[PDB]
Paper text:
Comparison of KAI2 and KAI2ply2 showed that there was little structural difference (r.m.s.d., 0.2 Å) in overall structure. However, in detail, we found that the residue A219 of KAI2 was bound to aromatic residues as Y124 and F134 of the lid domain by hydrophobic interactions, while the residue V219 of KAI2ply2 was bound to extended aromatic residues as Y124, F134, F157, F194, and H246 of the lid domain. Thus, the mutation Ala219Val caused stronger hydrophobic interactions with more residues. The entrance of KAI2 presents an opened pocket and hydrophobic charge for the ligand, whereas the entrance of KAI2ply2 forms a closed pocket due to C-gamma 1 and C-gamma 2 of V219, which is a bulkier residue than alanine. Thus, the narrowed entrance gate might contribute to the reduced ligand-binding ability of KAI2ply2. Furthermore, when we performed superimposition with the KAR1-bound KAI2 model previously reported by Guo et al. (2013), the V219 was predicted to cause a steric clash with the bound KAR. The results showed that the amino acid residues of KAI2 ranging from 125–150 exhibited a higher B-factor than those of KAI2ply2, implying that this region, corresponding to the helical ‘lid’ domain, might be more rigid with lower motional amplitude in the KAI2ply2 protein. The results suggested that KAI2ply2 was more thermally stable than the wild-type KAI2 protein, presumably due to increased hydrophobic interactions and reduced flexibility. Taken together, these results suggested that the Ala219Val substitution mutation of KAI2 not only impaired ligand-binding but also reduced the conformational flexibility of the lid domain, both of which would be critical for ligand perception and downstream signaling.
Crystallographic studies and biochemical analyses have demonstrated the role of KAI2 as a KAR receptor. A smoke-derived compound, karrikin (KAR), and an endogenous but as yet unidentified KARRIKIN INSENSITIVE2 (KAI2) ligand (KL) have been identified as chemical cues in higher plants that impact on multiple aspects of growth and development.
Author numbering: 2 to 268
Write the structure that this text describes.
């Protein structure tokens, strides 16, 4: 199918109990490789790639459609409808956490639970909010992306992933980062890092599990507290004693058991 092909959709298993996993900026569905083996015996598992990922056709990247996160949330609903999924647990990594939240505002019936990994509603600081970045910091990042994309990827990947700078996870993320077309990477980076989801958090009704590494380049721990305090749904927080923004990929031994506990157990 058109939607299936465009987003590299994979469906593993049959039956009603369904988990849908959405990845973050700069990576793809492979980020879930250490989690999926522990899900497939109990759940139908759905994987997909975000439009603009290097694994997707750049001719399908509509800059107007994806000028806000709503475009990605419409894609997610389209995938669920195409697969005739009536209800899922949604696991959202990084920007996909907010994409799932947005989708759940429009179609709360399609989600029983959202499990967030490394989520943030706002990366920019103001005098009463810590997101991790001053606007000048972000301006510097965008200029680096524009100036030399390969050099930026090589420098950013070890910082974002954490741990040893020459780990396989760092190498993998460097590769998927550079797999993006540079103009798309810049545009999507700006859209995500300048986003603001804070104001819609009180309207969320689907219960949320808020998970993150205690050390995360782009998500201060106080952001998990902020999500918990301001989401209008039932929520729980668990900060993991792990390093990195893609901890399910780079630190699975400590991270996967926590994610599984929150998938398998309700608040």
């Amino acid at each position: 199918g058109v939607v299936e092909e465009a987003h590299n959709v994979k469906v593993i298993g049959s039956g009603e109990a369904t988990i849908v996993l959405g990845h973050g900026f700069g990576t793809d569905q492979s980020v879930w490789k250490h989690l999926v083996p522990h899900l497939v015996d109990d759940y139908r598992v759905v994987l997909y790639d975000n439009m603009g990922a290097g694994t997707t056709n750049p001719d399908y990247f509509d800059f107007d459609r994806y000028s806000n996160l709503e475009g990605y949330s419409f894609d997610l609903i389209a995938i669920l409808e195409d697969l005739k999924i009536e209800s899922c647990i949604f696991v959202g990594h990084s920007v996909s956490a907010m994409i799932g939240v947005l989708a759940s505002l429009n179609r709360p019936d399609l989600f029983s639970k959202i499990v967030m990994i490394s989520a943030s509603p706002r990366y920019v600081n103001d005098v009463d909010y810590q997101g991790g970045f001053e606007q000048e910091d972000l301006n510097q990042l965008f200029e680096a992306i524009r100036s030399n994309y390969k050099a930026w990827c090589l420098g950013f990947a070890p910082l974002a992933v954490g741990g040893d700078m020459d780990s396989i996870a760092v190498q993998e993320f460097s590769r998927t980062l550079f797999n993006m077309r540079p103009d798309i990477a810049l545009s999507v980076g700006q859209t995500i890092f300048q986003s603001d989801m804070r104001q819609i958090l009180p309207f969320v009704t689907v219960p949320c599990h808020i998970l993150q590494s205690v050390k995360d380049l782009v998500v201060p721990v106080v952001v998990s507290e902020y999500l918990h305090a301001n989401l209008g749904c039932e929520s729980v927080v668990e900060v993991i004693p792990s390093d990195g923004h893609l901890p399910q990929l780079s630190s699975p031994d400590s991270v996967i058991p926590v994610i599984l506990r929150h998938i398998r157990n309700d608040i």
